[PDB]
Amino acid sequence: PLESQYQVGPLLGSGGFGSVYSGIRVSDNLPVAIKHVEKDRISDWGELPNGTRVPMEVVLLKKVSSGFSGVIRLLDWFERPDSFVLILERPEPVQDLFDFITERGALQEELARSFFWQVLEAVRHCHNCGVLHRDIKDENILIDLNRGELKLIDFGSGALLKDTVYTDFDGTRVYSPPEWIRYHRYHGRSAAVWSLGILLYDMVCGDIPFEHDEEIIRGQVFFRQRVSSECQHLIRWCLALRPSDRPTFEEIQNHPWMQDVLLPQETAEIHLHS
Template sequence: MKQPPLSPYIVYMLEWFEEEDDYILILEYPCPCKSLRRFLIDKRPRLNESLARGLMIQAVLGAKHCLDREVFHCSIKEDNMLVNTTTMELKLIDFGGSCLVNPSGFENGHLGGCHPPEYPSEYHAGPTTVWSLGAVLYSMVTGNKPFKTAFDRMIANVTIDHTLSRECQDLINRCLTRDPAERATLEEISQHVWFIQGQMSGVTQESEDGPNQSQ
């Protein structure tokens, strides 16, 4: 967490101490800030796509930085992201359950957030991270969870809100694909047309007044 190059999308570790049975981490605390979950609750019913886009690309780049360092966050969800309510900067937090990437995959083990269909059988860091990010994006732009039941999650039966732009719908579908081999990669997500739209318009975040309508 302190080894350069640092990522602006991951909480910065100021210092750490090793005790006999534990580690103590001293981390930055952006101010003013809220967890993404609290931010979404306060912005009900949902975020417009421009604001969601600006937050989401930061979450994607933070997650990609972790995997590029061979670190599997394991618990990407709204509670584990902080939003600076002045600058709209987002940072991943809570690496307590993280582990090093295992190329052979994982079985069971700690996994927070929205579990992918392949869990708890063999699952891999990359596709699992993409699935978790897709669930977060869905919550941002709809104000709801992507799956009503555990069975819906197992078969990846996600209800798409057709008032969203086609590009946003496509990104959600690419992330929440049942087969992990068919899911988008983090590299593909970061280059998705939905994010490119924001770069082309020169807008990463818009007025927070009300949800975005179809574009």
């Protein structure tokens, strides 16, 4: 019974993902996020071992549930006549990466390296659990400000990870690869690497590199801020036009720019004021 279990606070945000409210679990005063998604707005539907029909987002979240703090944890969910309600963990204080970059501008490379590394660990965890996120971007990354820890949110555009071709997509166009733009065809990991290149450019430059299809297709990267040669190299590698020319996750984390990463707590202390 959702009403007696949770105390609802103010709206945190709304959009393609639904409507998300601040909340508190009444039993232990635990901070939570209460996310409502209309059934009519749900694109595709998933399984669950017991065989009840839930949104794919519920399927994906349960598959990535663990002690690992790099991905948002699904605590509970309810079905209503016209909607599903998802109870998610809530770090406090928290800020999404989009608001963070909007406020601070382009990030120092040490900060970007720490953030980007944690994103890579989170995305590797998802793939490991058979989940493809499909909407990696600044707005879908939360910063636990006290701990310096990032969390992937909004799995509502995701899919079970497969090795065959995807011919469907409903994530964010400006983070989508040229093979999707040109052919409506992409493979999971190499498309994820593309979005990671877009994200990394966004962190160090303070905005995304491409706005229009023609720019995505052309793949020419211009740096508008001063960015180190090693960071530029990594970005341009992730944003290779041919999917098979893109780095693996392993090649990204072994890249010279990625070495000597700060611990999350170190990151909080130096860059988040902690």
